[PDB]
């Protein structure tokens, strides 16, 4: 809740996290934090909510697939 001008330091929406370094990568959420922020240990890092992977199937006028 509180802002972090007063009291390594990364600004988020649910406050700020002290003692961890933010990364721009995408991983699976392990510790739920809030506002899409997730933390995992591998020291400790913080990252946004990565929703698995993106896989859009092709669509056309005439295309059908049946499992075998």
């Amino acid at each position: 809740g509180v802002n972090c001008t007063e009291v390594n330091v990364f600004q988020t929406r649910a406050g700020c996290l002290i003692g961890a370094e933010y990364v721009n990568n995408s991983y699976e959420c392990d510790i739920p934090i809030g506002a899409g922020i997730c933390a995992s240990y591998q020291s400790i890092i913080a990252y946004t909510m990565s929703l698995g992977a993106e896989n859009s199937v092709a669509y056309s006028n005439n295309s059908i697939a049946i499992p075998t």
Partner: protein
């Protein structure tokens, strides 16, 4: 003749999370509270545990209601859907928040010792969930949640749904442009109704107003005297004797613990009601979006084809597409027909006739056909049924095998 109409069904999902600690709520920075509150045991620790559990289960419920797929599906770059125009449903990249105009209008229409915890999943992730689910149900048919995704064209999956509801699919092809135009007109009409009528979204506004009224009543109820000498917490700490201040503040914190307890019970009952409503919404999600339902009066008023999942603030909004028949006409029916002393029963429908000419038809649509042998079966004779009529039955190939 049949028409296509769309309705709305709004169910709450999640309220606003609250966090309360006992000591700062009952008083501000007093050691007397520290040495007196522990004499009541761990009463306020139980309340903190209950609120943390409610927040955890609310986050889990919010994760469970929407994230029901293992992958995120992006929309194809071609908007051709067999003559069907879906413009205000799919999100438009001309908005920084990546929202369709319908939920934009819905969000525009829908309006110290406390902490307001933000939700675990933000509105951007909810919009991404709804966009991915809409893409998965528009390009992968009604069979994609059982495992790896597939792809089926939109008229073919509509024909599959029409086969599954109990009518022939050919009536989809004879009025495909009419069906698309009626769907576009219904979407525009429901968009105008949502943008105009302000009473259609009463449930979310009611639950948010209930939570805000509970918080405001708690805030106004905290600053009461409760029969004590002083109302301000630190005024009695400097006006009354510290040996003599073991009664008034004790009664004050006892009454405040009573108020916090009844607020916790009210919040728990409201959370149970919201949990039941969200379980019902998750049942609707599993039954009407992932596949087509066959039970009646569950999604829309009439026979249900498929539904549109969309994002709503502190809830979910539904677009249920139904099947409303029209143009009623009187006709004569018969239990069976008898030919050459043998009774013939319809294969899947019923006999229909206007005058002296009998025809067969499907379940809930009028398509007259010549009574043949391949679409009927013979069981017994025409002497046990009541009120049978007489008509001839043509025989397939019978004049074709004479050569």
């Amino acid at each position: 003749n049949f028409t296509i109409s769309v309705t709305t069904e709004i169910l709450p999902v999640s309220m606003t999370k609250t966090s309360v600690d006992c000591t700062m709520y009952i008083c501000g920075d007093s050691t007397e509270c520290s040495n007196l509150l522990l004499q009541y045991g761990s009463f306020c620790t139980q309340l903190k545990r209950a609120l943390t559990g409610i927040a955890v289960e609310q986050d889990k419920n919010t994760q469970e209601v929407f994230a029901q797929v293992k992958q995120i599906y992006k929309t194809p770059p071609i908007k051709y859907f067999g003559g069907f125009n879906f413009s205000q449903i799919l999100p438009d990249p001309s908005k920084p928040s990546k929202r369709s105009p319908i939920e934009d209008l819905l969000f525009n229409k829908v309006t110290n010792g406390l902490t307001v915890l933000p939700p675990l999943l933000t509105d951007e992730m909810i919009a991404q969930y709804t966009s991915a689910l809409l893409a998965g149900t528009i390009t992968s048919g009604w069979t994609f949640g059982a495992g790896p995704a597939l792809q089926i064209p939109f008229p073919m999956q509509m024909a599959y749904r029409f086969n599954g509801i109990g009518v022939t699919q050919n009536v989809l092809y004879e009025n495909q442009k009419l069906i698309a135009n009626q769907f576009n007109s219904a979407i525009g009409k429901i968009q105008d109704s949502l943008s105009s009528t302000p009473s259609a979204l009463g449930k979310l506004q009611d639950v948010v107003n209930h939570n805000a009224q509970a918080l405001n009543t708690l805030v106004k109820q905290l600053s009461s005297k409760f029969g004590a000498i002083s109302s301000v917490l630190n005024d009695i700490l400097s006006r009354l004797d510290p040996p003599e201040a073991e009664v008034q503040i004790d009664r004050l914190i006892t009454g405040r613990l009573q108020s916090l307890q009844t607020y916790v019970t009210q919040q728990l009952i409201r959370a149970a009601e919201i949990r039941a409503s969200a379980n019902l919404a998750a049942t609707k999600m599993s039954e009407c979006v992932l596949g087509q339902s066959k039970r009646v009066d569950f999604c829309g008023k009439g026979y249900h084809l498929m539904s549109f999942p969309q994002s709503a603030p502190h809830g979910v909004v539904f677009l249920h597409v139904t099947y409303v028949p029209a143009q009623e006409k009187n006709f004569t029916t018969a239990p069976a027909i008898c030919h050459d002393g043998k009774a013939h029963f319809p294969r899947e429908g019923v006999f229909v006739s206007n005058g002296t000419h009998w025809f067969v038809t499907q379940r809930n649509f009028y398509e007259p056909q010549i009574i043949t042998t391949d679409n009927t079966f013979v069981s017994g004779n025409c002497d046990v049924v009541i009120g049978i009529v007489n008509n001839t039955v043509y025989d397939p190939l019978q004049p074709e095998l004479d050569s």
